[PDB]
Design a protein around this motif. Structure first.
Motif, PDB file in Angstrom:
ATOM      1  N   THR A  49       0.849  -1.193   0.000  1.00  0.00           N
ATOM      2  CA  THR A  49       0.000   0.000   0.000  1.00  0.00           C
ATOM      3  C   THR A  49       0.887   1.246   0.000  1.00  0.00           C
ATOM      4  OG1 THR A  49      -1.910  -1.042   1.176  1.00  0.00           O
ATOM      5  N   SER A  50       1.892   1.236   0.878  1.00  0.00           N
ATOM      6  CA  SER A  50       2.848   2.346   0.976  1.00  0.00           C
ATOM      7  C   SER A  50       3.628   2.492  -0.330  1.00  0.00           C
ATOM      8  CB  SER A  50       3.801   2.170   2.181  1.00  0.00           C
ATOM      9  OG  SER A  50       3.126   2.280   3.432  1.00  0.00           O
ATOM     10  N   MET A  51       4.320   1.427  -0.742  1.00  0.00           N
ATOM     11  CA  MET A  51       5.026   1.367  -2.020  1.00  0.00           C
ATOM     12  C   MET A  51       4.177   1.923  -3.164  1.00  0.00           C
ATOM     13  N   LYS A  52       2.897   1.554  -3.182  1.00  0.00           N
ATOM     14  CA  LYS A  52       1.973   2.076  -4.181  1.00  0.00           C
ATOM     15  C   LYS A  52       1.729   3.572  -3.982  1.00  0.00           C
ATOM     16  N   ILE A  53       1.186   3.910  -2.812  1.00  0.00           N
ATOM     17  CA  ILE A  53       0.821   5.283  -2.472  1.00  0.00           C
ATOM     18  C   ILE A  53       2.015   6.236  -2.524  1.00  0.00           C
ATOM     19  N   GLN A  54       3.111   5.821  -1.888  1.00  0.00           N
ATOM     20  CA  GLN A  54       4.299   6.660  -1.738  1.00  0.00           C
ATOM     21  C   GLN A  54       5.050   6.822  -3.050  1.00  0.00           C
ATOM     22  N   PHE A  55       5.331   5.710  -3.734  1.00  0.00           N
ATOM     23  CA  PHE A  55       6.096   5.744  -4.979  1.00  0.00           C
ATOM     24  C   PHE A  55       5.346   6.429  -6.119  1.00  0.00           C
ATOM     25  N   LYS A  56       4.016   6.350  -6.100  1.00  0.00           N
ATOM     26  CA  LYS A  56       3.189   7.114  -7.040  1.00  0.00           C
ATOM     27  C   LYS A  56       3.338   8.606  -6.770  1.00  0.00           C
ATOM     28  N   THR A  57       3.350   8.977  -5.490  1.00  0.00           N
ATOM     29  CA  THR A  57       3.609  10.355  -5.059  1.00  0.00           C
ATOM     30  C   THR A  57       5.046  10.747  -5.412  1.00  0.00           C
ATOM     31  OG1 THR A  57       1.956  10.533  -3.240  1.00  0.00           O
ATOM     32  N   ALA A  58       5.980   9.819  -5.196  1.00  0.00           N
ATOM     33  CA  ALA A  58       7.390  10.046  -5.510  1.00  0.00           C
ATOM     34  C   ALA A  58       7.581  10.292  -7.000  1.00  0.00           C
ATOM     35  CB  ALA A  58       8.253   8.883  -5.037  1.00  0.00           C
ATOM     36  N   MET A  59       6.984   9.426  -7.828  1.00  0.00           N
ATOM     37  CA  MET A  59       7.073   9.545  -9.273  1.00  0.00           C
ATOM     38  C   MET A  59       6.424  10.826  -9.767  1.00  0.00           C
ATOM     39  N   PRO A  60       5.319  11.255  -9.099  1.00  0.00           N
ATOM     40  CA  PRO A  60       4.699  12.534  -9.465  1.00  0.00           C
ATOM     41  C   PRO A  60       5.563  13.699  -9.001  1.00  0.00           C
ATOM     42  CG  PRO A  60       2.351  11.725  -9.598  1.00  0.00           C
ATOM     43  N   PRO A  61       6.102  13.596  -7.757  1.00  0.00           N
ATOM     44  CA  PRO A  61       7.004  14.632  -7.257  1.00  0.00           C
ATOM     45  C   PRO A  61       8.284  14.669  -8.076  1.00  0.00           C
ATOM     46  CG  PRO A  61       6.117  14.757  -4.907  1.00  0.00           C
ATOM     47  N   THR A  62       8.772  13.499  -8.480  1.00  0.00           N
ATOM     48  CA  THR A  62      10.001  13.392  -9.273  1.00  0.00           C
ATOM     49  C   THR A  62       9.809  14.015 -10.661  1.00  0.00           C
ATOM     50  OG1 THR A  62      11.260  11.516  -8.270  1.00  0.00           O
ATOM     51  N   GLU A  63       8.788  13.555 -11.387  1.00  0.00           N
ATOM     52  CA  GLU A  63       8.537  14.018 -12.748  1.00  0.00           C
ATOM     53  C   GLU A  63       8.148  15.492 -12.810  1.00  0.00           C
ATOM     54  N   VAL A  64       7.489  15.993 -11.763  1.00  0.00           N
ATOM     55  CA  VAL A  64       7.193  17.420 -11.642  1.00  0.00           C
ATOM     56  C   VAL A  64       8.475  18.210 -11.399  1.00  0.00           C
ATOM     57  CG1 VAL A  64       4.774  17.326 -10.887  1.00  0.00           C
ATOM     58  N   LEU A  65       9.314  17.690 -10.501  1.00  0.00           N
ATOM     59  CA  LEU A  65      10.621  18.287 -10.227  1.00  0.00           C
ATOM     60  C   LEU A  65      11.509  18.161 -11.459  1.00  0.00           C
TER      61      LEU A  65
END
Lengths: 49, 58
Positions: A1-17
């Motif tokens: 759940t975390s890996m999903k929730i967090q890494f999706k946020t990470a990938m959005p934060p990453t690609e936005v950055l």
């Protein structure tokens, strides 16, 4: 759940950055290469001086 | 990124300071070379004059 929730946020934060910061990375990284040539010429001029 | 631009320009100012003093030293040498090169030219002309002068006397 975390890996999903967090890494999706990470990938959005990453690609936005990344979109904003890969440009600024290139800006910052191509400037670093200028020090490496501004230094290498400096020594040859000091040596020749 | 702004800090890196202040860091870069400082190096290239030193590139000029070295450039100027390096060309300035060579500039002084140049005059010396031309001073003596003339004097050596003067010496050789006088050398050749004797060389034939001593012959034509004998």
């Amino acid at each position: 759940t975390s890996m999903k929730i967090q890494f999706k946020t990470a990938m959005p934060p990453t690609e936005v950055l990344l979109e904003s910061i890969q440009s600024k990375v290139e800006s910052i990284e191509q400037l670093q290469r200028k020090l490496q040539h501004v230094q290498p010429l400096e020594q040859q001029n000091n040596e020749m001086c | 990124d702004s800090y890196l631009k202040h860091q870069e320009i400082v190096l290239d100012t030193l590139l000029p300071q070295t450039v100027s003093n390096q060309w300035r030293i060579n500039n002084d040498y140049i005059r010396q070379t031309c001073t003596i090169v003339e004097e050596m030219n003067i010496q050789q002309r006088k050398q050749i004059n004797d060389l034939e002068i001593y012959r034509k006397r004998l």
